[PDB]
């Protein structure tokens, strides 16, 4: 832990500076150091951890998809040698390393200490998300196990959020959006994908009347992402 000698409060302050600077690798490393201090994370600190790693893995997924596409076009075609495959493997190995880093943080020991609905559902969502990114690139004998590790984390998160959070809760809506996409493009379950997004959209719509203007904006922002997916899929 290269961050072990910095103050937790300085690690958090520098993650926010690094967001403002669009330095997401620094942001992630700062938030990694903060988590490794061993204290629970606040709501804001959880968002910083999520935002930081999502931008890092997002750059790697975009890069992976471009190289996977070139590599497929070269397997249809004039042989160019092993360079496309080797580079796509290097990026992929880096991507798997980032997903393993996040999963290790959730397993040591964020999830076992998360007693509140909002914290536990948040981390269980992250676990599903980072198993899903692994599954996007998996081809071997562990692909089925990876998919099931995503499904299992997503399901436990869904069970808690159903019992403990209103249908408009932004973490609950984000979980359902992502779980829906998992059904669609990972689990080959497009009907399940569509059913969960309609049901999520409809139940939140009925709860909107209970909300303040700011909560209303938060929730309706995510309902619009659910509706966009459904428009794309139907």
């Amino acid at each position: 832990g290269a961050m072990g000698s910095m103050e937790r409060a300085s690690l958090i302050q520098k993650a926010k500076l690094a967001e403002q600077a669009e330095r997401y690798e620094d942001m992630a490393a700062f938030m990694k150091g903060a988590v490794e201090k061993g204290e629970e994370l606040s709501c804001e600190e959880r968002n910083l951890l999520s935002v930081a790693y999502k931008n890092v893995v997002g750059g790697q997924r975009a890069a992976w998809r471009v190289l996977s596409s070139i590599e497929q076009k070269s397997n249809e075609s004039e042989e160019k040698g092993p360079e496309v495959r080797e580079y796509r493997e290097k990026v992929e190995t880096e991507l798997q390393g980032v997903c393993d880093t996040v999963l290790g943080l959730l397993d040591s020991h964020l999830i076992k200490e998360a007693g509140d609905a909002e914290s536990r559902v948040f981390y269980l969502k992250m676990k599903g998300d980072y198993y899903r990114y692994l599954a996007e690139v998996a081809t071997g004998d562990d692909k089925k196990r990876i998919i099931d590790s995503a499904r299992s984390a997503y399901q436990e998160a869904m069970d808690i959020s159903k019992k403990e959070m209103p249908p408009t809760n932004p973490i609950r809506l984000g979980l359902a959006l992502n779980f829906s996409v998992f059904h669609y493009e990972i689990a080959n379950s497009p009907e399940e994908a569509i059913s969960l997004a309609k049901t999520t959209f409809d139940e939140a719509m009925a709860d909107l009347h209970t909300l303040s203007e700011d909560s209303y904006k938060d929730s309706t922002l995510i309902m619009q992402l659910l509706r966009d997916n459904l428009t794309l899929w139907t």
Binding site: E22, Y24, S50, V51, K54, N55, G58, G59, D129, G174, L177, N178, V181, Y184, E185, I222, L225, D228, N229, L232, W233
Partner: peptide, 10 residues
């Protein structure tokens, strides 16, 4: 138009 997941890249 790519399907949405949260959070989104910058």
């Amino acid at each position: 138009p790519r399907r949405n997941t949260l959070p989104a890249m910058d």
